[PDB]
Each structure stands twice: as C-alpha cells, then as structure tokens.
Amino acid sequence: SYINANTIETAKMIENMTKEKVSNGGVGVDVELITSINVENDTFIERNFTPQEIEYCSAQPSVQSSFAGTWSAKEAVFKSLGVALKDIEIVRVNKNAPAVELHGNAKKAAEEAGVTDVKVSISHDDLQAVAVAVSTK
Amino acid sequence: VTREAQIKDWVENELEALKLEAEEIPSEDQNEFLLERTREIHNEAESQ
C-alpha cells in the first residue's frame, strides 16, 4: 500500500550507485517533474527527441510521463559524460532496460573522455521521472 | 515554472544525500532503508 512499484524501481536505481555495486565511472542523476513536459509544444519535442523516441513515447498510456522519463535519461547521460540533447538517443522497449547510443558531438566527446559503455536506468510515475546514467570507460 | 525547476534541483540533492547516507548502512538492511527513505522523498516533492 505504502511501497508502490515506482518506489521499488527508484530504490533499485539508488542501490546500483553505491561504491560496492559500481565505482570508478561517470555517475549522472537527473530528475524531471512530468508537469515541466508540454507535449503540445511540438518545437521543444522535435529539437530534443529523435523520431524513434517520439513514436515510442506517444504509444504509451501516459505520454507526458514517458517523455519525461526519456528527457531525464538524456540529461542523466549528459551529466555522466561530463562535457541540444538530440545527439543522445535512448532506445526503450517494453519490460527491458533501455540502451544509450550517441550520434553527433556527444559521440565525439565520449571518444575524447574515453567512454565505451553508457548504461541508463529509468523510473517515471504521475509526479516525476528519475534517471541514473553510469558511463564506464 | 521557476519554482518547478528549484523543486527538481531539491530532489536531485536529496537523492544524492540519500545515496551518501546509504553508503554507511550495511548491505542487508540497505534495500528497506532506500524504500522507506525514497517514498519519504516522493512525498516531500509532491507536497512542494
């Protein structure tokens, strides 16, 4: 009643940032409140979200919560690297962890920093989306 | 919108601070401690 699915998901993500679990890599935590995402404002979406994300997000039960999940992931990846958000692309599929892959200047700055793997955990409910990106070199 | 940005910042600083408090907790009680203390943060972010 007290520990809903979003609390379990978000404690797991915080548990996997402790020194005993993963250490010696870029760690980026980013939260977004879902009310900050306007999905009607098409300019903000097209400029910061790839057409693969837009068609995945817009198929979900809560479009606004899913777009916020993605936007948190992008900004969580960018804080992990340590260097627009269009470049970073989050490939999310149902009941599976999403993969990160870079395209433009983000991909260049990942070779400059010497970052091989970028894993990202996401959780989103009715209030906020929390994303934790771990960039191992 | 300005205050919704400050609230986002306040949740990030509280998830960071949670992680630091959870470092010292032993590796058997660490699940229960994040579950209780994460919910408490969700609440204080909704409130705000």
Task: Tell me what you see in this structure.
This is part of a larger assembly, with 2 copies of chain A. With about 140 residues, chain A is of the alpha+beta class. In chain A, strands 1-5-4 form a 3-stranded antiparallel beta sheet, sandwiched between helices. Chain A has a two-stranded antiparallel ribbon with strand order 2-3. Chain A starts with a helix and ends with a strand. Chain B: Belongs to the thiolase-like superfamily. Fungal fatty acid synthetase subunit alpha family.
List the helices and strands and how they pair.
The structure is cut from a larger assembly and holds two copies of chain A.
Chain A: H1 5-15, E1 26-33, H2 42-48, H3 51-57, H4 63-81, E2 89-91, E3 99-101, H5 105-113, E4 117-124, E5 128-136
Antiparallel strand pairs in A: 1-5, 2-3, 4-5
Subunit structure (chain B): [Alpha(6)beta(6)] hexamers of two multifunctional subunits (alpha and beta).
Protein name (chain B): Fatty acid synthase subunit alpha
Family (chain B): Belongs to the thiolase-like superfamily. Fungal fatty acid synthetase subunit alpha family.
Descriptive labels:
part of a larger assembly; 2 chains; 137 residues; alpha+beta; three-stranded antiparallel β-sheet; two-stranded antiparallel ribbon; 39% helix; Fatty acid synthase subunit alpha (chain B)
Characterize the quaternary organization of these chains.
part of a larger assembly
**Helix segment count of chain A?**
5
**Total E-strand runs of chain A:** 5
Largest interface: A-B, 24 and 23 residues
Q: What is the beta-strand fraction of chain A?
A: 15-25%
Q: Specify the overall morphology of chain A.
A: globular
The level of helicity of chain A is 25-40%
Order of helices and strands of chain A: HEHHHEEHEE
Name the structural class of chain A. alpha+beta
Biggest sheet, spatial arrangement of strands of chain A: 1-5-4
Can you summarize the main beta sheet of chain A? 3 strands, antiparallel
Distance between the termini of chain A: 41 Å
What Rg of chain A, in angstroms, do the CA atoms define?
A: 15 Å
